[PDB]
Symmetry: D2
Subunit: 87 residues, 4 copies
C-alpha cells in the first residue's frame, strides 16, 4: 500500500512537505525513494513502525519542498519498483 | 530509558499485560527480554518505532500475564544487561 | 484524506477488518462512521492521534467484518468544511 | 503514569526539550501543564493518542527550554481520580 500527498494543500511558491506512506508484511528487503522530475531526492526523512503480532510494518518518507508549476514529484518502491505520482 | 508497568493495576488471579518501554539512539545491536522469576519469556510481542531525523528508536515489549503472589517479573536490556523489576 | 480498506485481502466468508483512515486539520466537529448497507455498525472502535502545534489529526475507525458479494460497506465523514457529509465506498 | 525528562542529557545553558508523558484511562477532565519556577510555560505543544476500545490515552506535553542550575521545572496533572493536582519535578 502506497499513498502520496502534501502535508498542506499546495500554493506554488510556498514551502510545504511531500509524504509517501508505505505498508506491508513479513521480513522484507524493500527500499523507498521520493523523486523530483524523475531523480531520487537525497536526505529524505522517515518514520518506521513495525509490530511483531502480525509481521506488519508502516513507513512514512517525507521531505520539505516548494511546489512549482514545472516540477513533477513521485514515490518509488523496489527491493520492478512501483511509481506513484502526486496530484 | 527503560520503564516497566502493567496495562491495568494488578489484582492477583486476573489476566493482565506487562510492558517494557525502551528508548535510545543511533544504529545499535541492542536486545530486550521480559523475565518470570528470572527466566526469559518466549513469544513476547513488540512494537518498534524509529525516526531518521534524530537516529531515535522507541520499543515496547508486552505480554499477557496473570499476576500471582509468588511470581517476580522484570525487563532486561543487553547488546552488561540492565534489569528493571516491576512494582 | 479518507481511505477505506481491508486489513488483509478480501475472501468472501472469511473474517477480516475494515478500516476508515481520516486525516485533516481542525478536528473540530469531525464525525466518522462505518456503514453496512447504509446502516451504522456497532462493533466500531477507533485510534485518535492529534498534534496541538498545527491542529492536525489522524483517525483510524476499524471493525471486524466478514465480507460478502451482496453487502456494501462504506465510511461516512461530516465536517464544517464539507457542504454535505462524504461517503467513500470500499473496493 | 507521569514521567518528566529532557530529550537529550542536560547541559546548563544548552537548548533542549522538556517532556511530560502522561498515560491513563478515561481522559475525561485531564489537564496537563509544564511549569518553570511554578509558572505555566506558553511554548508548550502536545501529541494526544487515545483508543475508544478501553478509554486509554497517551499524552506528550513538550517545549524547547535552556536548563539552568537556578531554575526548577515541573509537570502538573489534574484528574477526577486525584483528590489534589499532582506536581512531578524533573531530575
Ligand atoms: S512518524 C511519528 C510522528 N511524527 C511524524 O509523523 C512527523 C514528525 N515530523 C514531521 N512530520 C511528521 O509526519 C512530517 C513533517 S515534519
Ligand atoms: S505499539 C502501536 C500501537 N499498539 C499498541 O500500543 C498496542 C497494541 N496491542 C496491544 N498493546 C499495545 O500496546 C499491548 C496490549 S495489546
Ligand atoms: S492511529 C495510527 C496508526 N495508523 C496510521 O498511522 C496510519 C494508518 N493508515 C494510513 N496512514 C497512517 O498514518 C497513512 C495514510 S493511510
Ligand atoms: S505521542 C506518542 C509518542 N510517545 C510515546 O509513545 C511515548 C513516549 N514516552 C514514553 N512512552 C511512550 O509511549 C512510553 C512510556 S514513556
Amino acid at each position: 500500500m502506497i499513498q502520496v500527498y502534501s502535508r498542506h494543500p499546495a500554493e506554488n511558491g510556498k514551502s510545504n512537505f511531500l509524504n509517501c506512506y508505505v505498508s506491508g508484511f513479513h521480513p522484507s528487503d524493500i527500499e523507498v525513494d521520493l523523486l523530483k522530475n524523475g531523480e531520487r531526492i537525497e536526505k529524505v526523512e522517515h518514520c518506521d513502525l513495525s509490530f511483531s503480532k502480525d509481521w506488519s510494518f508502516y513507513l512514512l518518507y517525507y521531505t520539505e519542498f516548494t511546489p512549482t508549476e514545472k516540477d513533477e514529484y513521485a514515490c518509488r518502491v523496489n527491493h520492478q519498483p512501483k511509481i506513484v505520482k502526486w496530484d
